[PDB]
Amino acid sequence: TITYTSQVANARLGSFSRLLLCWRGSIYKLLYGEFLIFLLCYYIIRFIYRLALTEEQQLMFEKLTLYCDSYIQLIPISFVLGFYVTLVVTRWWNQYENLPWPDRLMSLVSGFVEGKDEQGRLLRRTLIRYANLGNVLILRSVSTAVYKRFPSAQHLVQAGFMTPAEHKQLEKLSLPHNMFWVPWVWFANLSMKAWLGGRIRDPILLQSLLNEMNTLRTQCGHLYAYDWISIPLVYTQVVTVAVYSFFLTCLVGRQFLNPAKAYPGHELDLVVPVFTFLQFFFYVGWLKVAEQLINPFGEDDDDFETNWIVDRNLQVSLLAVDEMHQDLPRMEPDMYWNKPEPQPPYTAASAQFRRASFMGSTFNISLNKEEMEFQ
């Protein structure tokens, strides 16, 4: 994930242009090899036309160039790229929104499951660890960085996500499918055991816990679905064929023909097709947006930082359910205890943001006494 949110907070003078001086997660990084190949092919064709063809062969090449340039169309490639990239971006943000965060569940585990002794602490840690284990199982199923971090379940055992007893239980329950769903059944059974043991005082709390757990399960299932059900290969190939046919046609039709031939549109040989190269920039960078975002769990610069998410979830969950259980700050009256209208101060750098409230768009409507009387 490349974050530039701070750099585009305000629409200043050339705010987006200053982003052109970036390299990580940039279009140059994703485009330099393709552009070098295209440049080499274009100039090889140019040198063949100039220094390797006879006059009749050059005339044939010029007719071919005009014929090709009559075929280079902007609307179809732009439309297919726009629709495909919109689909890819929608799926990319949906895949992000299905990344499981145990924060609601860890709050409910810290609150509902009672006991400051070793048994209650162990129970809360085990529940939140089941949640984190399910999350890390689906993430190592779908993310290449997480899989490189945990190539096997024994790596999960050595990393503390899974105890050896849990690993043996998972091996005993082995089915010819992905077994990421198991910790959710473990969570349900352990929560039922906790309620029957008195650690959960009411079944309302048990229902809330299992509702948050099922929400996490649905998110992990959506992650598995997006990893499994790819965008259909035919649509990807359609967009690739559109872009590649466009620039294969440009490889010949955008050649600078001999200016002495007085061909319309070929009155100035600039050697470098700056507009064709700009088109390559735009269209193949539009394609590279989709190429980078089609699997946002790879190892691109703009791909999701799933290992950081895993570590943060584990640390925050364990802290919330173990150290922060019934460990509250002292409850004391606040600054506005006797003030019916609080007014927090503004700094010197923020005093310009103290704005009057919006009372509705109809507040300033002016009416006379005659028209404000009820009929």
Going by the annotation, the residues of the binding site are: 9, 292, 295, 300, 303
Sequence-ordered list of residues with C-beta below 8 angstroms from that of 274, at least 6 positions apart, any chain: none
57 binds, among Ca ion, its own copies, none (CB under 5 to 8 A by kind): none
Q: Which of 55, 56, 198, 360 binds its own copies (CB under 8 A)?
A: 360
Taking the complex as a whole, the smallest distance from the CB of residue 43 to its own copies amounts, in Å, to 19
Burial of 374 from C-beta contacts in 10 A (0-12 / 13-18 / 19+): exposed
Which residue in the set 300, 309, 320, 325 belongs to the binding site for Ca ion (CB under 5 A)? 300
Examine residue 298 and tell whether it contacts Ca ion (CB under 5 A).
yes
Q: How far is Cα of residue 79 from the mean position of the Cα atoms in its chain? A: 23
C-alpha to C-alpha distance for 328 and 324, rounded to whole angstroms? 7
260 in contact with its own copies (CB under 8 A): no
Binding of its own copies by 233 (CB under 8 A): yes
- Of 161-169, 203-211, 291-299, 339-347: span binding Ca ion (CB under 5 A): 291-299
Gaps (C–N > 2.5 Å) in the chain: which residues precede them?
A: none
Which positions from 104 through 143 interact with its own copies, judged by CB under 8 A? Answer: 104, 106-108, 110-112, 114, 122-123, 125-126, 129, 140-143
Contact 277, 99 (CB under 8 A): no
Ramachandran sector of residue 262 (left: φ over 0; alpha: ψ -120 to 50; beta: rest): left
Positions in 210-229 near its own copies (CB under 8 A):
210-214, 217-218, 221-222, 224-225, 227-229
Choose the one of Ca ion, its own copies, none that binds residue 221, judging by a C-beta under 5 to 8 angstroms depending on kind. its own copies
Site for Ca ion in 228-267 (CB under 5 A): none
**Site for its own copies (CB under 8 A): how many residues?**
234
Q: Name which position in 57, 207, 261, 272 contacts its own copies (CB under 8 A).
A: 207
Cα dihedral 255, 260, 265, 268, rounded to 10, equals 80
Interface of this chain with its own copies, residues 265 to 294, rule: CB under 8 A: 265, 267-268, 270, 275-276, 278-279, 281-283, 285-294
Q: Give the binding range for its own copies (CB under 8 A) out of 17-25, 39-47, 48-56.
A: 17-25
Burial status of residue 208 (CB atoms within 10 A of its CB: 0-12, 13-18, 19 or more) = middle
* 146 lies in the site for Ca ion, by CB under 5 A: no
Q: How many residues bind Ca ion (CB under 5 A)?
A: 5
How far apart, in whole angstroms, are the C-alpha atoms of residue 363 and residue 205?
A: 46
Work out whether 303 is an interface residue with Ca ion (CB under 5 A).
yes
Q: Angle 75-97/203-228 helices, nearest 10 degrees?
A: 150
Residue nearer to Ca ion on the CB measure, 253 or 298: 298
354 near its own copies, judged by CB under 8 A: yes
The three-state secondary structure class of 211 is helix
Point out the annotated binding site for Ca(2+).
Answer: 9, 292, 295, 300, 303
Cα–Cα distance for residue pair 257/50, rounded to 1 Å: 9
- Going residue by residue from 54 to 73, which x/- string records binding to its own copies, judged by CB under 8 A? ------x--xx-xxx-xx-x
Residues 6+ apart with CB under 8 A from 270: 256
Residue 48: CB minimum distance to its own copies, A: 17
- Cβ-closest position to Ca ion: 298
Indicate the SS3 state at residue 199.
coil
Radius of gyration of the chain (CA): 31
171 binds, among Ca ion, its own copies, none (CB under 5 to 8 A by kind): none
- 87 forms part of the interface with its own copies (CB under 8 A): yes
Could you give the C-alpha distances from 219 to 14, 131, 138, 239, 318, in angstroms and in order?
Answer: 39, 12, 10, 30, 21
Catalog residues that contact Ca ion under the rule CB under 5 A. Answer: 292, 295, 298, 300, 303
